[PDB]
Specification:
fimbrium (chain A); seven-stranded antiparallel β-sheet; cell adhesion; mainly beta; homodimer; Fimbrial adhesin (chain A); elongated; signal (chain A); fimbriae; five-stranded mixed β-sheet
């Protein structure tokens, strides 16, 4: 009865990074700025279907380090992921779409981003809904000396969100959505 | 320095199924193909940007498997196909996929996962296509009566048939595990019995 829908990406924009001003420089790793957090209410759209859902994020970029950080948008440990731009990494946080759900640091091979209880209780799902969404947070990290100037950051897939459900027919679809870092130009100066 | 791109779906339309007229010759024969959808294609399922790399695509169906049928797609020999449950009782579908370019064969979907291009990868795990900047495919679907059919004006919901996984000899690309959905666009099908009349004089 219910229509399937192509899962929709959730994306965050490099263009929102402030100008990176390297002050007096040699501390590595360090966060050099946060992107403006984004959200997508309708990553997965179940149509007329009403079911208990949860989302599991798996990062797909190479891990190159770890850093402790407290996003402005207690601290957590974050895995640093390789952007393909030398000297530059990123750290990732994700949360449920609605407020009152916590920012989940990406520091494991996979993690449930909503409900976070599913990480310790395999039977935990959200209340029945017709859709599943999320919030996305990213910060840029200097892993070493940075290229100065107007540096092109490529669009990168950060990972996938897998939709799971207590209902077998929905769980077995293994619906997945890409989590994207939209590329752009950053400005780096001393 | 190449940009990643959101994988694009490859889709096929329920609306292209002809009207299903059940004739007495195969009315009670199950399973049987009741019609083919118009085949579709997408050259740019995966878009590597400026990257040039050796690629291949592995399809995994995600609908329930409910049977097997031997069939020769009209679009030289028959093949065995797994029948997948559409969620509409009595109606299943079979799937074939191929490389985007001609000269690559139709690959029947009859395994948990299968390489659709190059088909050589099903017998040689080190086989990839020639280097390209993109990967695409062709999609074929037929509807199957698995039992007594619902007659009338029947709604077929949009269904995801499975995923295509992009693999590569280049580790950085292979580890992205880029996946694209393979979609059956829903629609309404018409199912009726062959006409008949009686004498009135």
């Amino acid at each position: 009865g219910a229509n399937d829908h192509v899962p929709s990406p959730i994306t965050i924009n490099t263009s929102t990074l402030p100008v990176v001003v390297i002050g007096p420089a040699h501390t590595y790793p360090r966060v050099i700025g946060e992107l403006t957090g984004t959200s997508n209410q309708y990553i997965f759209n179940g149509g007329s279907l009403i079911a208990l859902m949860r989302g599991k994020f798996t990062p797909t970029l190479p891990k190159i380090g770890k850093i402790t950080y407290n996003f402005r948008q207690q601290s957590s440990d974050f895995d640093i992921f390789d952007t393909g731009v030398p000297g530059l990494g990123i750290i990732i946080g994700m949360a449920g779409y609605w407020p009152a759900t916590p920012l989940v640091p990406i520091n494991s091979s996979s993690i449930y981003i909503d409900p976070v209880a599913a990480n310790t209780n395999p039977n935990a799902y959200n209340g029945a809904t017709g859709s599943f969404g999320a919030r996305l947070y990213v910060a840029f990290v200097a892993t070493g000396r940075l290229p100065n100037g107007y540096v092109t950051i490529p669009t990168k897939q950060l990972g996938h969100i897998l939709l799971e459900s207590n209902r077998a027919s929905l769980n077995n679809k293994r619906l997945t959505a890409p989590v994207m870092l939209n590329g752009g130009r950053i400005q780096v100066q001393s």
